[PDB]
Amino acid sequence: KVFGRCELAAAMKRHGLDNYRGYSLGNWVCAAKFESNFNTQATNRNTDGSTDYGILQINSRWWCNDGRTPGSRNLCNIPCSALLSSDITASVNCAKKIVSDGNGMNAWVAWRNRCKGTDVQAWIRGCRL
Ligand SMILES: [Cl-]
Ligand SMILES: [Cl-]
Ligand SMILES: [Cl-]
Ligand SMILES: [Cl-]
Ligand SMILES: [Cl-]
Ligand code: NA
Numbered sequence: 001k002v003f004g005r006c007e008l009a010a011a012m013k014r015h016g017l018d019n020y021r022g023y024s025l026g027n028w029v030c031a032a033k034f035e036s037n038f039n040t041q042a043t044n045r046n047t048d049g050s051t052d053y054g055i056l057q058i059n060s061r062w063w064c065n066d067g068r069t070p071g072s073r074n075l076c077n078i079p080c081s082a083l084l085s086s087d088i089t090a091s092v093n094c095a096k097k098i099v100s101d102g103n104g105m106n107a108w109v110a111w112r113n114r115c116k117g118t119d120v121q122a123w124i125r126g127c128r129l
Contacts, residue, residue: 001086003038003055005029006127008088013129015092021099025129026120027111028095032056033123034110040091041084054083054091056108063094 003011009029012018018025035057036042044052050061050069058080060066062073066080076094083091098107105111 001040003032003040005033005038005123006129008032008038008055009124009127009129011088012092015089017092017095020096021104023099023105024120026123027105027115028056029123030115030118030120031105031108031111034114035108040086040088043084051080053080055088056091056095057110058083058091058094058098063098 009025012028013025017028032038032055036055038055040055042054042057044057046052046059046061048061050059050072051066052059053064053066058064058076060069060072060080063076064078064080064083065072065074076097078090078094083094099105101107105116
């Protein structure tokens with residue numbers, strides 16, 4: 001599923017991601033825009049052999065099991081394919097664990113490079129929230 005901007009903002013808010021660990025909704029919508037272009041089915045292979053999955057490009061190196069990242073962990077205790085569903089529940093719950101692990105949203109390199117320090121509120125402007 002490819003979300004619309006306001007549609008994703010509404011879903012993220014409903015799942016309690018807005019202001020989670022101090023990060024406003026705009027930060028999460030911005031991260032998703034540049035990680036996946038709002039596409040739940042997004043996948044990308046990393047140089048080390050792991051793969052990033054879903055709307056927030058969660059890495060099989062640490063967080064999910066895809067059966068093909070030898071030596072990796074599964075800290076969210078989910079198949080990586082669950083991160084590709086049209087329902088973003090699994091992605092949100094995993095993202096909450098990632099952003100809680102000490103480095104905040106810096107875990108998402110696209111957020112650090114393209115969202116951090118910018119007018120992130122622009123990403124939710126105009127939406128009926
Ligand atoms: Cl915001
Ligand atoms: Cl594996
Ligand atoms: Cl393969
Ligand atoms: Cl959803
Ligand atoms: Cl933080
Ligand atoms: Na894994």
